């Protein structure tokens, strides 16, 4: 066994959250919101003189991709779902259409908010992010998401080409079997690191989709095949070291004319439509802090290879992964 592998696998077992297909609670919470939308849409379309448009829901996000983590105490579950409205995008304003969904959910939980890229509804200990799409078959064969806020300019409210099922396929398909299992474990490790070390400043935290897209570009398996048994062992500490170092290598000093200084920026393009940099909203100063903390994590991963005393190696890692990283007693 690779150094600290037992402790990484135990850490994974503590942080992992069962995916939608294995998680009745999440399916029930998802479905309760989809039912509230269907009921709520009846009221909204009561004064329009026609039936509410129908929609086709689909699972999105980490709970669809088997990369979900449990929140830390006081954190929330992030239930991501897509709804494809039986509407032509050319007939409707994208913020108009998100208002249907917001109004439908007005009285559900702690209420609902139009965000740039979804309508979010709040419950105790979880939120549900509904991504709202027009029907491809009515919208020129394209799947487009409703972008813009109520307080957005005409240029910022748009139906944007989006490929959530292609992204989910690219994550599922990069690797297979226990190689793909290591890939998903390493995405989860970085999400717990994110939640433990980016808790001061929420909006500074690297988005889950960005960490996932970074792993899609740059993750490499680390494993060994025993020359006698051909038994395979994985080295999650090494896989994370190489991945973290590769991320650090892709930061680029980027001049900002407004501030008259450079900030180190990591660009991570989605590998499907709309091919945007998913880290674009992070400020330069937040990027600088992200790089510094990633470098500190790299240095701890290297320390965990050298310590020899298992307690010391694991303590170095728990300083970046938090209190659920197992630290054996010396
Ligand atoms: N090609 C695209 C474009 C956008 N998204 C959006 O990305 C959302 C998920 O983003 P986020 O919640 O940050 O990522 P997760 O992988 O769910 O990470 P976490 O576990 O941290 O929530 C999805 O619901 C979807 O709307 C996507 O999945 N695929
Ligand atoms: Mn999510
Ligand atoms: Mn979300």
Please give the domain boundaries of the chain with CATH numbers for all domains. 20-162 (3.30.460.90), 167-321 (no CATH)
Tokens at 145, concatenated: 């998401």
Distance of CA 330 to the CA centre of its chain: 36
| CA 24/CA 84 separation, integer angstroms | 23
Out of 209, 210, 212, 275, give the residue to mutate to test ligand 1, the one with the largest number of ligand atoms within 8 Å of its CB.
209
Between the CA of 207 and the centroid of ligand 1 the distance, in Å, is 8
- The phi, psi pair for 180, rounded to 5°, reads -65, -35
* CB-CB contact of 318 with 310 (8 Å): no
Q: How was this structure determined?
A: X-ray
| Ligand having the closest approach to the CA of 194 | 1
Which of 280, 318, 278, 320 lies closest to 298 in space, CA to CA?
320
Residue nearest atom 2 of ligand 1, based on CA coordinates = 164
Cis, bond preceding 248 (omega within 30 deg of 0):
no
Resolution of the structure, angstroms: 1.5
> Going by DSSP bridges, is the β-strand pair 223-225/126-134 parallel, antiparallel, or unpaired?
unpaired
On whether the CB atoms of residues 70 and 17 are closer than 8 A, the answer is: yes
d(CA 283, CA 289): 10
Q: Whose CA is nearest to atom 8 of ligand 1?
A: 61
Q: What is the DSSP letter of 16?
A: B
Distance between Cα 104 and ligand 1 center (Å): 23
């Amino acid at each position: 066994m690779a150094p600290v592998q037992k402790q990484f696998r135990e850490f994974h077992d503590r942080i992992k959250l069962a995916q939608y297909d294995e998680n009745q609670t999440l399916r029930d919470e998802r479905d309760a919101v989809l039912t509230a939308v269907r009921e709520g849409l009846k009221k909204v379309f009561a004064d329009r003189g026609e039936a509410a448009p129908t929609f086709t829901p689909f699972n999105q996000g980490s709970y669809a991709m088997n990369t979900g983590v449990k929140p830390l105490e006081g954190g929330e579950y992030d239930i991501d779902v897509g709804i494809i409205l039986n509407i032509a995008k050319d007939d409707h304003d994208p913020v108009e259409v998100k208002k249907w969904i917001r109004d439908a959910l007005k009285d559900y939980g702690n209420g609902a908010e139009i965000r740039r890229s979804c309508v979010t509804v709040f419950k105790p200990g979880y939120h549900v992010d509904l991504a709202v799409y027009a029907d491809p078959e009515l919208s020129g064969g394209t799947l487009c998401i409703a972008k813009g806020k109520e307080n957005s300019g005409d240029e910022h409210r748009l139906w944007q080409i989006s490929d959530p099922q292609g992204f989910q396929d690219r994550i599922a398909s990069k690797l297979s079997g226990d190689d793909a299992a290591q890939f998903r474990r390493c995405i989860r490790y970085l999400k717990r690191w994110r939640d433990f070390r980016f808790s001061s400043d929420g909006n500074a935290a690297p988005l889950g989709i960005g960490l996932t897209a970074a792993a899609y570009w740059w993750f490499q398996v680390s494993k060994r095949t025993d020359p006698v048994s051909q038994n395979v062992t994985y080295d999650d500490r090494d896989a994370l070291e190489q991945f973290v170092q590769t991320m650090l290598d892709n930061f680029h000093d980027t001049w900002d004319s407004k501030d008259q200084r450079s900030y180190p920026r990591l660009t991570v393009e989605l590998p499907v439509q709309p091919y945007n940099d998913v880290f674009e909203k992070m400020t330069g100063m937040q990027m600088e802090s992200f790089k510094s903390k990633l470098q500190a994590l790299l240095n701890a991963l290297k320390t965990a290879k050298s310590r020899l005393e298992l307690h010391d190696a694991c303590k170095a890692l728990a300083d970046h992964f938090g209190s659920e990283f197992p630290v054996p007693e010396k």
